[PDB]
Enzyme design. Sequence first.
Site, PDB file in Angstrom:
ATOM      1  N   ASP C  43      12.880  -4.141 -23.151  1.00 58.89           N
ATOM      2  CA  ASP C  43      13.381  -2.775 -23.232  1.00 58.89           C
ATOM      3  C   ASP C  43      12.655  -1.918 -22.202  1.00 58.89           C
ATOM      4  O   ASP C  43      11.422  -1.831 -22.219  1.00 58.89           O
ATOM      5  CB  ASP C  43      13.191  -2.207 -24.638  1.00 58.89           C
ATOM      6  CG  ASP C  43      13.932  -0.900 -24.845  1.00 58.89           C
ATOM      7  OD1 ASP C  43      15.171  -0.888 -24.698  1.00 58.89           O
ATOM      8  OD2 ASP C  43      13.273   0.115 -25.153  1.00 58.89           O
ATOM      9  N   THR C  76      20.511   5.613 -19.286  1.00 62.27           N
ATOM     10  CA  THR C  76      19.227   6.189 -18.908  1.00 62.27           C
ATOM     11  C   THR C  76      18.387   5.230 -18.071  1.00 62.27           C
ATOM     12  O   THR C  76      17.174   5.420 -17.944  1.00 62.27           O
ATOM     13  CB  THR C  76      18.450   6.619 -20.154  1.00 62.27           C
ATOM     14  OG1 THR C  76      17.168   7.130 -19.767  1.00 62.27           O
ATOM     15  CG2 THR C  76      18.259   5.438 -21.095  1.00 62.27           C
ATOM     16  N   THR C  77      19.008   4.204 -17.499  1.00 61.62           N
ATOM     17  CA  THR C  77      18.307   3.214 -16.689  1.00 61.62           C
ATOM     18  C   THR C  77      18.761   3.195 -15.239  1.00 61.62           C
ATOM     19  O   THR C  77      17.921   3.137 -14.337  1.00 61.62           O
ATOM     20  CB  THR C  77      18.487   1.812 -17.294  1.00 61.62           C
ATOM     21  OG1 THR C  77      18.098   1.831 -18.674  1.00 61.62           O
ATOM     22  CG2 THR C  77      17.638   0.793 -16.549  1.00 61.62           C
ATOM     23  N   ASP C 374      24.265   2.950 -33.640  1.00 66.92           N
ATOM     24  CA  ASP C 374      24.959   2.604 -32.404  1.00 66.92           C
ATOM     25  C   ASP C 374      26.465   2.802 -32.532  1.00 66.92           C
ATOM     26  O   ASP C 374      27.112   3.240 -31.573  1.00 66.92           O
ATOM     27  CB  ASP C 374      24.607   1.172 -31.974  1.00 66.92           C
ATOM     28  CG  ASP C 374      25.095   0.103 -32.948  1.00 66.92           C
ATOM     29  OD1 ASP C 374      26.216   0.208 -33.485  1.00 66.92           O
ATOM     30  OD2 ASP C 374      24.337  -0.863 -33.179  1.00 66.92           O
TER      31      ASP C 374
HETATM   32  N1  LIG Z   1      31.438  -9.022 -19.886  1.00 65.90           N
HETATM   33  C1  LIG Z   1      31.067  -8.212 -18.865  1.00 65.90           C
HETATM   34  N2  LIG Z   1      31.746  -8.205 -17.696  1.00 65.90           N
HETATM   35  C2  LIG Z   1      31.388  -7.405 -16.675  1.00 65.90           C
HETATM   36  N3  LIG Z   1      30.345  -6.557 -16.720  1.00 65.90           N
HETATM   37  C3  LIG Z   1      29.575  -6.461 -17.831  1.00 65.90           C
HETATM   38  C4  LIG Z   1      29.903  -7.304 -18.991  1.00 65.90           C
HETATM   39  N4  LIG Z   1      28.996  -7.016 -19.944  1.00 65.90           N
HETATM   40  C5  LIG Z   1      28.161  -6.071 -19.439  1.00 65.90           C
HETATM   41  N5  LIG Z   1      28.507  -5.741 -18.180  1.00 65.90           N
HETATM   42  C6  LIG Z   1      27.815  -4.744 -17.324  1.00 65.90           C
HETATM   43  O1  LIG Z   1      26.419  -4.710 -17.631  1.00 65.90           O
HETATM   44  C7  LIG Z   1      25.942  -3.363 -17.613  1.00 65.90           C
HETATM   45  C8  LIG Z   1      24.919  -3.146 -18.721  1.00 65.90           C
HETATM   46  O2  LIG Z   1      24.322  -1.860 -18.572  1.00 65.90           O
HETATM   47  P1  LIG Z   1      23.195  -1.357 -19.607  1.00 65.90           P
HETATM   48  O3  LIG Z   1      21.974  -2.225 -19.428  1.00 65.90           O
HETATM   49  O4  LIG Z   1      23.832  -1.226 -20.970  1.00 65.90           O
HETATM   50  O5  LIG Z   1      22.850   0.118 -19.061  1.00 65.90           O
HETATM   51  P2  LIG Z   1      21.814   1.068 -19.848  1.00 65.90           P
HETATM   52  O6  LIG Z   1      20.545   0.254 -19.909  1.00 65.90           O
HETATM   53  O7  LIG Z   1      21.721   2.298 -18.978  1.00 65.90           O
HETATM   54  O8  LIG Z   1      22.473   1.301 -21.186  1.00 65.90           O
HETATM   55  C9  LIG Z   1      27.152  -2.457 -17.775  1.00 65.90           C
HETATM   56  O9  LIG Z   1      27.142  -1.438 -16.771  1.00 65.90           O
HETATM   57  C10 LIG Z   1      28.364  -3.352 -17.596  1.00 65.90           C
HETATM   58  O10 LIG Z   1      29.145  -2.906 -16.484  1.00 65.90           O
END
Ligand SMILES: Nc1ncnc2c1ncn2[C@@H]1O[C@H](COP(=O)(O)OP(=O)(O)O)[C@@H](O)[C@H]1O
Lengths: 142, 521, 507, 50
Positions: C43, C76-77, C374
């Site tokens: 995290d 936020t990342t 969530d």
């Molecule tokens: N099955 C998938 N196909 C394509 N892209 C994906 C899939 N699952 C997740 N992603 C990509 O992975 C990224 C995960 O971002 P995330 O770590 O949740 O951002 P944050 O940490 O800011 O919440 C998303 O932007 C999404 O576009």
Amino acid sequence: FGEVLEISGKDYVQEVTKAGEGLWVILHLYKQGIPLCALINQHLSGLARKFPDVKFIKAISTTCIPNYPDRNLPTIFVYLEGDIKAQFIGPLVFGGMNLTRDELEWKLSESGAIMTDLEENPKKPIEDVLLSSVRRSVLMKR
Amino acid sequence: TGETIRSQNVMAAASIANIVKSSLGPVGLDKMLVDDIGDVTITNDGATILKLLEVEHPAAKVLCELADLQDKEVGDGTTSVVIIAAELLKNADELVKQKIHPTSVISGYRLACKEAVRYINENLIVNTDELGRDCLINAAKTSMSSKIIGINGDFFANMVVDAVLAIKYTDIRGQPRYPVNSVNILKAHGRSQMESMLISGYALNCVVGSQGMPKRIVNAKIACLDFSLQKTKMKLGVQVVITDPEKLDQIRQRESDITKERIQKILATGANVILTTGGIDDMCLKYFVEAGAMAVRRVLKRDLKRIAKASGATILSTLANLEGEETFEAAMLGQAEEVVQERICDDELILIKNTKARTSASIILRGANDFMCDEMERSLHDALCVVKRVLESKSVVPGGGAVEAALSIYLENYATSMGSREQLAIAEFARSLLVIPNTLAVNAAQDSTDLVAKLRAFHNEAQVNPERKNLKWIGLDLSNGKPRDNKQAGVFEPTIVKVKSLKFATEAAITILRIDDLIKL
Amino acid sequence: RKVQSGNINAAKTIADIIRTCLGPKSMMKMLLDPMGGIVMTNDGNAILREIQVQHPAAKSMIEISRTQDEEVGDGTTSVIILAGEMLSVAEHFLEQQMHPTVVISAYRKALDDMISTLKKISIPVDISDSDMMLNIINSSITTKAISRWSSLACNIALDAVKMVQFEENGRKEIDIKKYARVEKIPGGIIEDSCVLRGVMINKDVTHPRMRRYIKNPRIVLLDSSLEYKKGESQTDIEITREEDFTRILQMEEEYIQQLCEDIIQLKPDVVITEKGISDLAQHYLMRANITAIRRVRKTDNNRIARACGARIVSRPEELREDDVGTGAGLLEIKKIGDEYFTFITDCKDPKACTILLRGASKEILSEVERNLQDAMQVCRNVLLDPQLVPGGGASEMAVAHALTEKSKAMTGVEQWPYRAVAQALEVIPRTLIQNCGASTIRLLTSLRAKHTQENCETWGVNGETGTLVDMKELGIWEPLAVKLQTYKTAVETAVLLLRIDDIVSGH
Amino acid sequence: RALAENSGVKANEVISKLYAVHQEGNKNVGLDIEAEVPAVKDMLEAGILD
Ligand SMILES: Nc1ncnc2c1ncn2[C@@H]1O[C@H](COP(=O)(O)OP(=O)(O)O)[C@@H](O)[C@H]1O
Ligand SMILES: Nc1ncnc2c1ncn2[C@@H]1O[C@H](COP(=O)(O)OP(=O)(O)O)[C@@H](O)[C@H]1O
């Protein structure tokens, strides 16, 4: 009272040999060039204006222990007029610059027994990944 | 000793003057300040940085003290004085090192300042209004930042000039006072931005939740009430010593029977609608609607203060507590002319027509962003400040950096015509005057070497061939690096402020140069 | 010009920490302790909170990220990564001549063009049916969680979201944080969670003597001004002796006697009291046809301030004739389980329902709490704007292509910073390709050659295999307001970090 | 760039001006002061060939 006051050597040596009973005293040091001292002083000044039942003392490091070493950081000495039970030595037990009044009143726990449900979550730790996973796997399977 | 401490003081004054150097004018970068604790403050003001700064040098301390003393009596002009003093010190250091008595250069600086003041006092403007406040098309566009709308700015400028020139004020019995400044505003959303109206008489707060008044006739005069009657306690005025359980249920009827005579006396002559704040009951209105007396709810402290400071009808002269059995006078009676609730912006607000003393205009905004409330407010503030500063004092100067060149040329001519011992001092004082246009051109990401040269070449023609004194006074521009005439669309500045700033800078320079040694003697 | 370089250096150092923690196949970090401990976690928020820096820019970025996470909750990342990339591509290449003026206008124009492109690409959606919303929630929540009872939890969360909205008046204000909490009670079957009124009452009511049963009365709560005080504002009476104490009891009688002729017309019940309990005065209070409760914490205060609407002021008696307590409210002390429970139904300020779940230990509590949190966050982010955008790495390429086309068509002077800030948007697809385990150059070239044909803006990179796939067949969509907020925050951070001159000290 | 930097002015504005006029291929920066900032001259009629 409810406010800090500058102390000297005679008053300190008198309060040491006074030996009262249920009088709470909290002494602190002071150092120049360290923002943590000013931060903890402001925190104590803000906390003293809410619980008028414990004496606070803001002493200077140049008045006590003339032969001080390099590791003589300003700490907190909570005394019961001749009793020793808590010696907060080392700022690592707090967190550094991320200090608040809740952490102070939780670490104290001796100048006003109120307990505002702070013993359940005084500080959020870091949850492990493998340990928590194996614990959940053990709890679910049994 | 002797010269070493003076050089050290000059170096310290020059180093402390290079902090607020990159923050002159509206276009400047920000500055971060730390209090050695953990909090940071970001500001780009010429006064906030000098006020929140540590000092440890005696010369710097007295300079900050003089700057604070100047700012306590003068509004603006507290940043260029430090740069002027630093330039004067760095120019007099070479003169002192060239084996020159400081008294000679001090007398030369004094004579140059006197000549500059005498030449400035003979170049003013007698007229205060030119075709309706600079043709009412140029005095409003420069004082208003147009970043999202500018196509229909002529209508906004016309509205501003009509609001600032029609209404006036006079109370000192010697000079016309500034007009209204805290005018009423109305932020609307989803309206036609290409259409605006101007009405007279400001409105109060919107009555929501108590609009049961069948207003069908035209009134005349109204009244006002600060407190509010209630069966139980809620505000100030209710006694706490009288213990009566069987009287609080009938205290409302007794209060109504007591105030019936006051209501009748109000209904007499010419007064109907009264102003009561929140805390009143609905039975009194239903009982008084059969006679013709009503009450408008939704009254705050700001509206009451505005009513007391506008028409002058005060209430403290007679009423002060909950005791409504006072005398009946015309002080607590709002003498008006017409109070009607017309249909505007799909609402029903209190509309007072033909207001005594002052007559404010209701400025209603249109459906746009919330930043519109800060777009015309700054322009109106600048306009009222200008019309209140240039009215009683007709000593104004056009442009911002078009006079320093002519002043330096005149000082050089005077030094050349003199031919005495105080000749190089006037030349140095003239050379130490081109630090404001150069800084303005540097901060604008332009070439200052060419801009200052062109400005000097254009100003020399006005002095070589005496043709006129009002024209040929072009200066610098902020949009681009091109000379623009600061007369048809420029912004004038008070000359008294510049005179006081120059005098304070000269006094500070003389005081610093008069200091010999700082050794503990 | 050395302060901006030292600032962007620390910015890039901070950004190059949690860069490999995006996507389904993310890495894991490990932090050691000075005493001898080691904790492994993946995290980025915990790493950012446990870190300790000394540069003002790093602290400002940390505070900005914390504010963004607290206000929204998703996204936020990538903000720090985008800010660092933009800084390293703009200031570390276009500051050799020192001209910090047109860069702000170029950034503003790029932000406006990005906003216009993202607004002219959105697709509408309907909120009439409920199956599509549940499918979208299940597709957006399938990240790194368990899958066994997610359908019922998401349905309950959607019902609570649709039931908690009542403050509509034209601005559409939704509050579920301080308006709906969570309750827990062990015992019974786990398949019975639902929604209820929810009253924070456990063991606060104490009735030593047996009286009448509460059916459907009219409870009107008052204030809390009956403790160990000296009176209203004077010190005429005090609690110092044993006799005069009971004298206050007589006054207490008066404290209700005038109330019998005051606004008491519906006969209330319990009242809020912080101090005041005995074996003789409580009996007289109960005999005076009135009841009183004690033991009030922060949860009960929040409940009576949100649901009931109780305020705190120096005014116990003589209140409004129609303040609170409007409606028939039942208060039957049920014996379901093992503690006293109250079900205040039909009263003041409705649409304030809470959840009712019967699990087991603390693990079930934590998992249902995080699931509800969530799901409610996803529902709030979706219902805030009925516009979806195909994510995964398809909109950024189209935005960059449109920006490049606009820059080539305008033929301006400041086209170099515009192109530099437009070509700095392909960081997320590159990171996804690197995390998947494939070539980052050939795949990017193929994506660029594909995203320039005719009608092709939904072709992204799969986050589990490493191939280009159309988004119309997978099902990866994101909300619209989150991307706009992220872009605005990144632009604001870049503008703030680019307008830093000199740094000094003061007081 | 080397011809504009060895004169007295910058080279970015000169390149922008040379790329903003037209693709005729007969425009180049001069040597006098009146040909540094604009840099709009026709070297075909002057007699500068290679
Ligand atoms: N099955 C998938 N196909 C394509 N892209 C994906 C899939 N699952 C997740 N992603 C990509 O992975 C990224 C995960 O971002 P995330 O770590 O949740 O951002 P944050 O940490 O800011 O919440 C998303 O932007 C999404 O576009
Ligand atoms: N439109 C303009 N055209 C030319 N100069 C301007 C314009 N607006 C402001 N200035 C210049 O900017 C300067 C602002 O000075 P200011 O920061 O107010 O000084 P202080 O901080 O001492 O009050 C003025 O001296 C003025 O000459």
